[PDB]
Design a protein around this ligand. Sequence first.
Ligand SMILES: Cc1cc2nc3c(=O)[nH]c(=O)nc-3n(C[C@H](O)[C@H](O)[C@H](O)COP(=O)(O)O)c2cc1C
Ligand code: SF4
Ligand code: FES
Lengths: 512, 150
Amino acid sequence: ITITTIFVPRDSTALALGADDVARAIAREAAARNEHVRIVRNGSRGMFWLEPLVEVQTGAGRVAYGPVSAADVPGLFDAGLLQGGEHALSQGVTEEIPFLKQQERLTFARVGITDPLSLDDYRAHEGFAGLERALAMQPAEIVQEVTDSGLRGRGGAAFPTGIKWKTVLGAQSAVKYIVCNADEGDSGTFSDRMVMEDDPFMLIEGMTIAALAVGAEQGYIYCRSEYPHAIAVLESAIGIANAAGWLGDDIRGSGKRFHLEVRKGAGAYVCGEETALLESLEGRRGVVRAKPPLPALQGLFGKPTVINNVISLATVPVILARGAQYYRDYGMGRSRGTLPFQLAGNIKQGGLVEKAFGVTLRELLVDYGGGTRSGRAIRAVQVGGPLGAYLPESRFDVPLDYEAYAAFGGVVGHGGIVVFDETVDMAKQARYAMEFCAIESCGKCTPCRIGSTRGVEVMDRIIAGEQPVKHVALVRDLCDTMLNGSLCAMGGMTPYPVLSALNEFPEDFGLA
Amino acid sequence: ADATRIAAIVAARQDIPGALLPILHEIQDTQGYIPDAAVPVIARALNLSRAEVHGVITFYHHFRQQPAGRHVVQVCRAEACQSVGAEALAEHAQRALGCGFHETTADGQVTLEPVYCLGQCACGPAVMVGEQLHGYVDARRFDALVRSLR
Ligand SMILES: Cc1cc2nc3c(=O)[nH]c(=O)nc-3n(C[C@H](O)[C@H](O)[C@H](O)COP(=O)(O)O)c2cc1C
Ligand code: SF4
Ligand code: FES
């Protein structure tokens, strides 16, 4: 008669921290006490220092406990878990935790609230309201709405999304494609991963709206092989959406057609570059294409192709459901909307912080992150991934805005934030940037393919203390060669962590 | 490796747009690796050259052409895990296992591989075994999880 709903996340981070064991321990304990529970496997709220974060539905709303280990579960029951009783691990009403409450979760609105594979949960929280509006608009109107919203590419290049769709719509071709770039290869990023594991229907809805906007009937999600959980969840969600008429040849009786499938990548960072991604989808080595031909005009199999990042596509439904002006009102300058920032690395309170553009790095580091995990001072923060610059403390007050970061050589990128404390060796960081480029180079460009390995060798000489002045000059020279002789940002932006490390921390390289 | 099943895997996929990577994944997923003897079968079905197919297999680090040990243990080497100790963990893993990266233990139980971010960047150092993730991995937890495998 009386059944208590308990939430135990199934996000791969929660799983990495023991969430399946927690869920089995809760089930075993309930059985041992003859109590009836329904264990809902939700996405994660994105407060990873509290995962596994168990929530209980009570009269006051959902209350949270974290982080929970299986050994804690009998004591949780003893303290009255099923009624939200107080325990050492109690966090209170989940939505009242300031880390979570002080966010602007436009895209991540459902993440951690819902069962990720439940259509009923999805639609009870505005799911498919954007698609239902889009089904009642002409294609050019959907393009115009995404344009008016101010949405820009959340993969990092921040190109205006609606203009991109306008090009695909205007192109003449019977076959057009939607391609979702889910390669999320950057260290410090997991917002795409979280959408795919914790709210897959939002990505499916966003790609379907894109298909309606430009006239595409086939979509592909290219997901990196390092994300087996995302791939399995997306495939289940596509099956579920298809069975319920949200995909297929007669979507909700509209007569519109859209088919979607997931493609697994194969360990190449450079397949996040949009044309190397297309080569991979077509079954070839992930070698960057010359880009006088835009993929929006000649992309997958030479057809007009929308290529967008997971977060870009996942933001389309709220833009349609709540309107362009609602979305455009957030942010600053030309950085309209919100971004799911990802706090990572040596961070005390890491996870997912969605905020309007204009928040500063210091606000995210201190007010949300709570400083380093070690307790030592922050020394350098890499923003925007392995190809981003390291930021010193003197830059922590620049507003997180595409134009303000670009002005000083910062990279917002996907919004990932990797914190290093005072123990970091910036010469070893510079060496790693070169090593990583040597590992991931698609091979088309000599400075990227071979110059990177020479940069490793020289950095080794610097780290061993051999002739620092001479060898730093050689590294500077090699960086200029990569800045000017790279056909994509792998080689072209490898100098960003190298030059920022060298410029901001010359003492780590043996210099004055 | 089951040559007959490989031919069927290829035949079921041979009309998929850009079928080569899904084919290579299904062969590796079911057989453990892509045997050299599968390349002519793949090449013929997709109207590709054998060198083309071999070049794809060689390009992508995920694909292996020889069986791995019983367990593939991937240790993240990328920046966020570095910031919380991935470098020392990688040194320890090689001492505890007695082999380097891209190598397999003498008892054939563990193949040690690097990976460059598992999307676990806020709870590193991160390790994946098969598809099971582990966060906050230090020398003690590493030895414990390797003990569990054996
Ligand atoms: C080395 C390299 C890696 C990249 N990785 C990604 C990625 O992981 N996810 C992504 O969305 N864009 C990535 N890009 C950018 C894509 O080339 C391109 O900007 C894509 O179309 C982004 O779509 P968007 O407009 O929605 O941001 C990468 C570019 C380079 C040079
Ligand atoms: S810069 Fe590097 S990854 Fe990019 S095209 Fe050249 S070789 Fe390939
Ligand atoms: S840097 Fe290791 S999981 Fe992302």
